[PDB]
Amino acid sequence: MANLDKMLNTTVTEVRQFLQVDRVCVFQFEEDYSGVVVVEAVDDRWISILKTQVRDRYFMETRGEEYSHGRYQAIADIYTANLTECYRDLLTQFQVRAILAVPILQGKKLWGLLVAHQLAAPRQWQTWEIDFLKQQAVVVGIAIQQS
Ligand SMILES: *C(=C)[C@@H]1/C(=C/C2=NC(=C\c3[nH]c(/C=C4\NC(=O)C(C=C)=C4C)c(C)c3CCC(=O)O)/C(CCC(=O)O)=C2C)NC(=O)[C@@H]1C
């Protein structure tokens, strides 16, 4: 079968349950580095962002180049982090307190992001959790090719 959608759904569920976080989702980039939240596991208590189309200026202007070379975002508390206003308001609209966002690659090509959000309260991200989510993104990268 190699059903990609099923594997991705299982992945984000697996991650959300194991890290005990409020949302894990996959953001898939369009050809211009806009994109869509294509798969999501979220706690019922918060609003689902599934299939939201996002036109993020940082991604669209850089064309993901930094994320293609392994940059990631790990922020425990988005209100004390130094974020520009419009990006903080996107996160606020997604009800985010803390964010761990890692690149999903096809070779060196940035295909999307694998993102964990904490929505209840801030949350320190541990070293291993960053490695965990990155390694999950590796597994997704393999699956995408062969889907
Ligand atoms: C203003 C014009 C807005 C805008 C600008 C910026 N976005 C920025 C960085 C950025 N954007 C993302 C995107 C997501 N985070 C998610 O959780 C999801 C979906 C589930 C998406 C699509 C991330 C991860 C980052 C961090 C990049 C990084 O620095 O590692 C920035 C730069 C950050 C800053 O200076 O605060 C700007 C500016 N994005 C908007 O949507 C509107 C258009």
Numbering used by the authors: 1 to 147
Could you share sentences copied from the article?
By applying 17 rounds of molecular evolution to the GAF domain of PCB-binding NpR3784 CBCR, we have developed the first CBCR-based NIR FP, which efficiently binds endogenous BV and fluoresces in various mammalian cells. With molecular weight of only 17 kDa, miRFP670nano is the smallest monomeric NIR FP that fluoresces in mammalian cells as bright as twice bigger state-of-art two-domain NIR FPs. After each round, we tested the best clones in mammalian cells and selected for the next molecular evolution only those which exhibited the high fluorescence brightness in both bacteria and mammalian cells. Totally, 17 rounds of the directed molecular evolution resulted in an NIR FP variant, termed miRFP670nano, consisting of 147 amino acid residues (17 kDa) and bearing 18 substitutions (numbering follows that for miRFP670nano sequence) relative to wild-type GAF from NpR3784: V7M, F25C, M26V, Y27F, P31E, S41A, A48S, N51K, Q55R, T57R, I72Y, G82N, H87Y, N99I, N117H, C119L, L136Q, and Q139V. miRFP670nano efficiently binds endogenous BV in mammalian cells.
To reveal the structural basis of the protein stability, brightness, and specificity to BV chromophore, we determined the crystal structure of miRFP670nano at 1.95 Å resolution. miRFP670nano adopts a GAF-domain fold, but with the N and C termini located in the spatial proximity. BV is covalently attached by a thioether bond between the conserved for CBCRs Cys86 residue and the C31 atom of the ring A, similar to the native CBCR’s PCB chromophore, but having a double bond between C31 = C32. This mode of the BV binding is different than in natural BphPs and red-shifted BphP-derived NIR FPs in which BV is attached via the C32 atom of the ring A to a conserved Cys in the PAS domain. In the chromophore-binding pocket, BV is stabilized by eight hydrogen bonds with D56, Y67, T84, R71, and H117, π–π stacking with Y87, and T-stacking with F59. Of the 18 amino acid substitutions introduced into parental NpR3784g, F25C, Y27F, H87Y, N99I, and N117H are located within 3.6 Å of the chromophore and either directly stabilize it or provide for it favorable accommodation. One of the important substitutions, N117H makes a strong H-bond with the ring D, which is absent in NpR3784g, thus preventing rotation of this ring and non-radiative energy dissipation via photoswitching. Another critical mutation is H87Y, which introduced a perfect parallel π–π stacking with BV. F25C makes additional space in the chromophore-binding pocket, possibly enhancing BV accommodation. T57R substitution introduced a flexible positively charged residue near the chromophore binding site, enabling electrostatic attraction of BV and its additional shielding from solvent. Substitutions Y27F and N99I increased the hydrophobicity of the chromophore environment.
